[PDB]
Amino acid sequence: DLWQTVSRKLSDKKAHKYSLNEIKLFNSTIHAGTQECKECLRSDIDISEDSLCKICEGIIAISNDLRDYSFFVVSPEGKVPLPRNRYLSVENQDGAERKIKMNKETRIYSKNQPFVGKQLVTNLWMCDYDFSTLNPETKKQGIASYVNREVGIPRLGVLRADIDNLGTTFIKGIPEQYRSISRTATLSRQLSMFFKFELSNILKGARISVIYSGGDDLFLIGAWDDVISKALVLRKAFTRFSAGKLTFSAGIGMYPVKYPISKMASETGVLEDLAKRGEKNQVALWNDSKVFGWSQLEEQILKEKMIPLQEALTNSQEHGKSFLYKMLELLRNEDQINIARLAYLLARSSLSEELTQSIFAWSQNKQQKVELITAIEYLVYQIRE
């Protein structure tokens, strides 16, 4: 009840966010901007050349430094503004040490660092995984380098995970006899340390950039297949970490490069909302029609259906991409005739006989044909010259 009342007071504070003077000064604007930043689209703040607001110009300057360095020093002089008339900059160990020596009341944060000698650094657990920074050639184009593929569709994938009923887990999950400030604080720390620190190890070797992990949610942009594969790896590891008792749902999107960033996050947020409907332990893959379970996508869609198709078509001289498209057309309609045409297509498809019977069986039963369609679509994207 104490935590519910604190959040209840917080929600009341959020409703009446502003006061009389703050609201009036919001509507007391003297000069229209007549010029806006490309990213922040803010006209009230002073915009310099390159058509960038002062905040976002600092944000871009923080980039190309976040990848290289691991010390975030809050100091009187820096790139992006911070409260108490301070600014935030990302510097190396020598640069941060300079800054703290120059002027006192300067804080320095170290990212994912093991404990070191006596210093005024504060350890911040932050997920900074970025596959592009590993290769200097791909470091120039951070996330757009995952679009570059020898084979496969160039589209990026956006993963938005979110733990189901985490608030209900803290309030109702812990029984009365085991609820305390210390027991709850441990649960907050284990969940925090999984997202902030363990996510980097889970997505190791994958073309994935971690925009955020932070406590309960997740945002990753990378190769479309790497995002899907590491979504299943992360789901399995999350089940091990939580030992059951906690499921998370995720939306996965397929968006090209130059797709709007706001639309990439919004449409995947919509997908996660779809996966949040029902028993909440679901993944919404690509379209809103493919809201599968985590076991269903990992096992039924991919291993049970997509892998047999990929192996069979690789064995032939050409990797399909013409039987697969014709299969999709015959699977999109509900006609009795299209089933017969699918039977003829499989017979002439020149693959193994027991696989054609399996594909025909899959198309027969609803909730099993949609798995077959997603298996075909995943395979089609896997092979796009």
Question: Does position 43 bind RNA by CB under 7 A?
Answer: yes
217 binds, among Mn ion, another protein, RNA, none (CB under 5 to 8 A by kind): Mn ion
* 278, β-bridge pairs: none
Question: Does position 356 bind another protein by CB under 8 A?
Answer: yes
Q: Which is nearer to another protein, 48 or 122 (CB)?
A: 48
Binding segment for RNA (CB under 7 A), chosen from 36-44, 189-197, 208-216, 239-247, is 36-44
Measured from the Cβ of residue 51, the count of other Cβ atoms closer than 10 Å reads 13
* 130, β-bridge pairs: 209
Q: Which is nearer to another protein, 66 or 370 (CB)?
A: 370
Stretch 261-290 residues interacting with another protein (CB under 8 A): 262-263, 267, 273, 277
Structure tokens at 287: 């379209």
Reported residue count of the chain is 385
Question: Does position 68 bind another protein by CB under 8 A?
Answer: no
Q: What phi-psi label fits residue 73: left (phi over 0), alpha (psi between -120 and 50 degrees) or beta? A: beta
Angle between helices 336-348 and 323-332 (to 10 degrees): 170
Binding segment for Mn ion (CB under 5 A), chosen from 58-66, 163-171, 323-331, 345-353, is 163-171
166 binds, among another protein, Mn ion, RNA, none (CB under 5 to 8 A by kind): Mn ion
Q: Which residues does 245 contact at the CB level (< 8 Å), separation at least 6?
A: 169, 173
Q: Which of 335, 354, 366, 367 binds another protein (CB under 8 A)?
A: 335
- Tokens 């006192």 locate to 104
Q: Which of 35, 322, 352, 357 binds RNA (CB under 7 A)?
A: 322
Largest CA distance in the chain: 80
How far are the Cα atoms of 74, 230, 271, 298, 379 from residue 163, in angstroms, in the given order?
32, 16, 14, 18, 29
Question: How far apart are the C-alpha atoms of 240 and 223, rounded to whole Å?
Answer: 25
Question: Does position 273 bind Mn ion by CB under 5 A?
Answer: no
Q: 218 near 228, Cβ under 8 Å? A: no
Question: Does position 162 bind Mn ion by CB under 5 A?
Answer: yes
Q: Which is nearer to RNA, 77 or 318 (CB)?
A: 318
Q: Which of 12, 133, 113, 159 is nearest to 66 (CA)?
A: 133
Task: Output the smallest distance, CB 171 to another protein, in A.
Answer: 10
163 binds, among RNA, Mn ion, another protein, none (CB under 5 to 8 A by kind): Mn ion
Q: Which is nearer to RNA, 139 or 326 (CB)?
A: 326
Task: Output the smallest distance, CB 280 to Mn ion, in A.
Answer: 9
Question: How far apart are the C-alpha atoms of 331 and 338, rounded to whole Å?
Answer: 7
Q: Which residues does 43 contact at the CB level (< 8 Å), separation at least 6?
A: 32, 33, 34, 35, 36
Q: Which is nearer to RNA, 32 or 243 (CB)?
A: 32
Question: Does position 347 bind another protein by CB under 8 A?
Answer: yes
Question: Does position 39 bind RNA by CB under 7 A?
Answer: no
Q: Which of 127, 153, 156, 163 binds Mn ion (CB under 5 A)?
A: 163
How far are the Cα atoms of 37, 181, 270, 373 from residue 260, in angstroms, in the given order?
16, 43, 15, 27
Name the residues that contact Mn ion, by CB under 5 A: 162-163, 166, 216-217
Name the residues that contact RNA, by CB under 7 A: 36, 41, 43, 256, 322
Name the residues that contact another protein, by CB under 8 A: 8, 11-12, 15-20, 23-24, 26-27, 29, 31-34, 36, 41, 43-44, 167-168, 258-260, 262-263, 267, 273, 277, 321-322, 324-326, 328-329, 332, 335-337, 340-341, 343-344, 346-348, 356, 360, 373, 376-377, 380-381
